[PDB]
Amino acid sequence: AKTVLRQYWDIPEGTECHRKTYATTSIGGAAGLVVSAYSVALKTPTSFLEGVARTGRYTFTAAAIGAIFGLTSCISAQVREKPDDPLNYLIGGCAGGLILGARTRSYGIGAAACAYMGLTAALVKMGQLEGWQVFAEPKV
Amino acid sequence: LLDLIWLEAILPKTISLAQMKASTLVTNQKGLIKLYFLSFLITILISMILFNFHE
Amino acid sequence: ARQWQPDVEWAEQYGGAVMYPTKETAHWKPPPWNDVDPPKDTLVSNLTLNFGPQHPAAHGVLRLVMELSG
Amino acid sequence: MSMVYMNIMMAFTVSLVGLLMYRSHLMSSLLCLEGMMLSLFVMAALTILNSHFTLASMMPIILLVFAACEAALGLSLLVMVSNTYGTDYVQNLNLLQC
Amino acid sequence: MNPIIFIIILLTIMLGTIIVMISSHWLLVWIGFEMNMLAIIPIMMKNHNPRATEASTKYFLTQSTASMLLMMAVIINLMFSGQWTVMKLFNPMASMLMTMALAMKLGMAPFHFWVPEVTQGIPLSSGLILLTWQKLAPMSVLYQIFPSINLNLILTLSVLSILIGGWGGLNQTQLRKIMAYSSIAHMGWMTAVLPYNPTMTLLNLIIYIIMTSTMFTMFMANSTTTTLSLSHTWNKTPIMTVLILATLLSMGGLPPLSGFMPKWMIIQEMTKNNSIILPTFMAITALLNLYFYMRLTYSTTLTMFPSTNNMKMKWQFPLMKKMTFLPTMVVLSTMMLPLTPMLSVLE
Amino acid sequence: KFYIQEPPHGSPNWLKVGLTLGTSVFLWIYLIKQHNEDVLEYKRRNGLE
Amino acid sequence: SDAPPLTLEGIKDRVLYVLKLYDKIDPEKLSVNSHFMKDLGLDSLDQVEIIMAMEDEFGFEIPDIDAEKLMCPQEIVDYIADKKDVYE
Amino acid sequence: LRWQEDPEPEDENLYEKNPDSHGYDKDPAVDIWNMRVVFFFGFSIVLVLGSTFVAYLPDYRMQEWARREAERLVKYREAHGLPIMESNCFDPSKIQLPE
Amino acid sequence: MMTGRQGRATFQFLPDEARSLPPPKLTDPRLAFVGFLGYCSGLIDNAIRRRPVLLAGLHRQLLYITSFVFVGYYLLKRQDYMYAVRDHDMFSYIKSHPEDFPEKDKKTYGEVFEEFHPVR
Amino acid sequence: LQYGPLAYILGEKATKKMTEKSKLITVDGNICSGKSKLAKEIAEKLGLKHFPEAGIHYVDSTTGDGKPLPVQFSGNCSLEKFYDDPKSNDGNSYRLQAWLYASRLLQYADALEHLLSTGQGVVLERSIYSDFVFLEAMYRQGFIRKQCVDHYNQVKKVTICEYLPPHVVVYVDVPVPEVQSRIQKKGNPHEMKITSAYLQDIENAYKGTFLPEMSEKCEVLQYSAWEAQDAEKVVEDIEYLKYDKGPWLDQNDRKLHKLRMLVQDKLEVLNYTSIPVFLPEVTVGAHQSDQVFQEFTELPGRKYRAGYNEDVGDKWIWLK
């Protein structure tokens, strides 16, 4: 899961939308697969088809969010010529949050997800600009 | 509209109810040894296939 | 102006198996007060064996039906 | 690592995956635990013998000793499991967290 | 169980733990774990009821599986270094196996499912040995191999424990599962700071042991294993209700109580290494722990729940249980914050 | 007598009371000797006296 | 989840369906009010076998004293309701 | 009924039994002492002596000194024809501009 | 970090070099607080066992205080020793690495240019 | 040394004091059947310790000065009020029965503790094993609701399994009309309002559920009214019993240690008598509960643990 991220931060921001969309869709799909791995194992389905049916629903939902987010944030930096702007990710994140509302069929979940994904996506871009660290190597 | 509903709705009420749901999932287990250990196999594969922790 | 203190209805909230009942955990029952569950009913039957009539020790004409535990 | 190490480590994984995936019998999953001990025993014996680590030659022997203190312990619970229910099915051990 | 047999079995559990702590050989460390696991099962099945059997069966399977992984890591390390010393491992694959093995014995998520279950099926005294003394050995091995532990692996488990631990306990009414999930969340704080400063790992482990031991002792005094059962204590031992309040508040990390010290010192170390986001996430996520500690106080000390008529018969008898070390432990678990700089003695 | 039974604590356990007071006296004596000894060796090594 | 509740209309289908499988009752003239003996012509033992099927259908024991009175499909539906408390 | 519980008590009226009550306590002896300590230490000590203490604080925050100090400088800097206030608060001779 | 402090002396509570430090004075505020904790334990012990808190078992309470102070005193000796070691290692390292800790060149505020931001 | 693991290891076993005469005898029988006097005689002739039947104020006799405490500190349940209004709306019937069961449980624990520690036998008048007979009569006479019976079984089902049954069960049988006869000339007017059916239900439960089940685990002796008159006959039957059944044959030092450690601790005995099952008959409000408990704690010699109450002449507190 390191290579895919590297392929996403090694592309100039706001350009080559198709390449960035593939990366985000892959990352989104991987997240939906892990969710479906545990869901299948912990809550055993009542038939083989109901298991792949469950996995398809979860993987598709996570790939839809990954695709829209990568697509929306890539053009917004293309249209505005503002590559280093966390606002582009904010638009992208809330766009992904909206889809989660659509596929779950709940406006509240779509509303809540837009804000929390939108804020989460923006903070991701800020840290890349500022060089924040989530897992900081020991230094002192 | 503002004090009793929308200020309650966004910060306190939603942050609370998300925890309630997240708690039922992590505790909606049936104590079946068969299902837990299958989860360990998933974690071990994930730690390598995706995250390359073995490296 | 006696201050309100939890009544029976309030306490019942904390008597269930779980705090937040769902579709699944509706049927969960509280564990036994002393942790001992009732023993189960008839489970295992003794093996039944024909000790005859064609047996060296059955004298030829003794069908001795036995129930063995081991 | 010679081609033999592949099979012994391949054998250990097969036992490990076998253990984590219970079918119905508890005795079937106790053998996999004993199977893993045999893999580790062999793998240690090849490593120690090959390098002439003389004093380490006692390690595999000590390994078997606690390999059986689990089997003895594991069978002890199996007796107590079947007494309560009459069979060693794992689906009967669902009183806790349910 | 014959009283002589209980002591000898107990002395074997400590010997198994002590062997792991003083050993300088990967073989003995494994023997220590096996000896500890051998003599812990009988204490679980000291009453012989179906729930004790299930707990012992689930506990044996998890630890034995963990031991196979720990021995496998020891053999791979032997191949790639040709030595048995209990020090940093000499292969990335062995470190992953040992880290997961130790995480399985500690109960850190996602290998956590057994901890709520084993504790619920064993007596209160047995649970005290399971949630306090059984962390000393798995922790003394992480203390010696932390340089080689992968950074991303260890922190991921800690972030999962603090989340799984916090959410799990929200839904529980049994006291033996509230403490089971409280244990999991606290493992997250211990292992989160291990890469940065192992000394703070010991401090978080010592405070956890005292507060946990104090909680179990007060539960055993009244023989209470449910939330409601603990609600009648105000009608028997009112002094016992207040001590539970103070200890529970401390376990939540509220100042100026001892349970704030390990959290306070953990945040310092992580920040000094430029880790700002993770301590913030851990600190906020710990509010989940404080919430379901506050429900116990509401039902136990801050309000008077309905009682029963037969409760009047208990007023006439003294509390005859030992409650060993309880007066000392309660003080150490609430009034140690002014002596924070004493943590240097742990180094 | 008031109580119908003899309370287990009807009278002091003078063995306990003797040991309790003995330990307290011993430790204070041991500690006070310890501090005095520590002070002397502290001056001896630092050379101030 | 909690299973769907038993309703008097649900029981009715079960009884008639069970009677429908029976090979001695003609499906044409089996009404919810038809009588086993007089209308359908079944003999005593034929009646006893039907009651046995109902025990398999709903999985509970019916004493012989009660089955002596279940002479038409209606009271069967009533009896099942009384046992499961399906007032509906 | 749903449980055994005492009925609702009815609020005591202190004037019911003690027509001269100050409301501090049901004991006329103690009640009178509660009033006295509140009135003495409150109205006679804190408010009166405390108010007098504030009124005679020794030049709270050198407000009086600064007045007499400004008079001397204006007195001093007008006899010598100097400006009352110099537009610079620091000596330029000891400042190094960045360039 | 100081676990392997290049001194051997492993598994010793107070190494012999620790005798070169001034022992804690018995009037230490730290030690008095530790003793006060002992007294609080004694009162708690009486309370949970339903005895007159301030009076029952004076012999017992005297033992709580003394035991707490006895152990407390030795922890202060080791608490102060470890910190003394921390500075000893910190300074010698600085002395052994002049280049990594260079003496700074200090300028007065009449030469240091600081941006000014009005508040209006 | 207060009994515990150390005293046991030091060599204080139960078999070292148990003898073939250390027996636990229990005299049952319907109301006004002479069990009260008969059990008094069996103890003296065989030299056992006699335990009067555990009424409402049994626990009081075991603690403090032994004088009964006021009624409110015993649940307020009134035996006579049960006779006056057995179908009252304040649930006096079950609170009385629920209270009584705890009294018998506490008494039975007292009996076993004496038997194991001292080795002398003991004679009881009814016990936790025969207490359900009255509950059975109340339910069939419409005095206690169905939910009350379910509560009783749960409390019973988690406590009665920890104790061994009695050695000998002496049942004194008296026909219901005779009981009605022996009550009329008995004095107390409240008992005179007992209906016959109530005694019949006790009789039906006693013989049919209790006596059948005790025989397969205890040595049951049945005596008529006239036979019960002379205790010498009964004392002869008891002394020639064989004692060849029941769980008392397979108890050794290890198992009696577990039992003895339970009955000396009276709070562990009464643990489940107060399970948090909110039945209206036994539930108590917080305000009422707080009030009574503060009154109890100010009774003479109740403020502190026994032996530390200064007002009742205790001394040496500051060294104790």
Ligand SMILES: CCCCCCCCCCCCCCCCCC(=O)OC[C@H](COP(=O)(O)OCCN)OC(=O)CCCCCCCCCCCCCCCCC
């Ligand atoms: C910067 C570099 C690029 C980084 C990659 C960017 C792309 C990120 C891709 C995001 C993928 C989201 C993963 C969410 C998994 C959701 C799994 C799922 O589909 O099920 C969720 C559930 C619906 O399941 P349900 O219908 O209830 O099942 C049947 C039950 N009867 O519905 C629910 O229960 C709602 C709960 C799901 C919400 C999970 C929490 C949000 C996920 C974290 C996203 C945060 C970041 C997103 C923005 C991107 C940040 C850069």
Ligand SMILES: Nc1nc2c(ncn2[C@H]2C[C@H](O)[C@@H](COP(=O)(O)OP(=O)(O)OP(=O)(O)O)O2)c(=O)[nH]1
């Ligand atoms: N409701 C109820 N009353 C009980 C219970 N046990 C005793 N009583 C009451 C019934 C009687 O009024 C009283 C005593 O009953 P007895 O059996 O001892 O009859 P009595 O003493 O009058 O004569 P006797 O024992 O035969 O010599 O106590 C009980 O478990 N429930």
Ligand SMILES: [Mg+2]
């Ligand atoms: Mg009588």
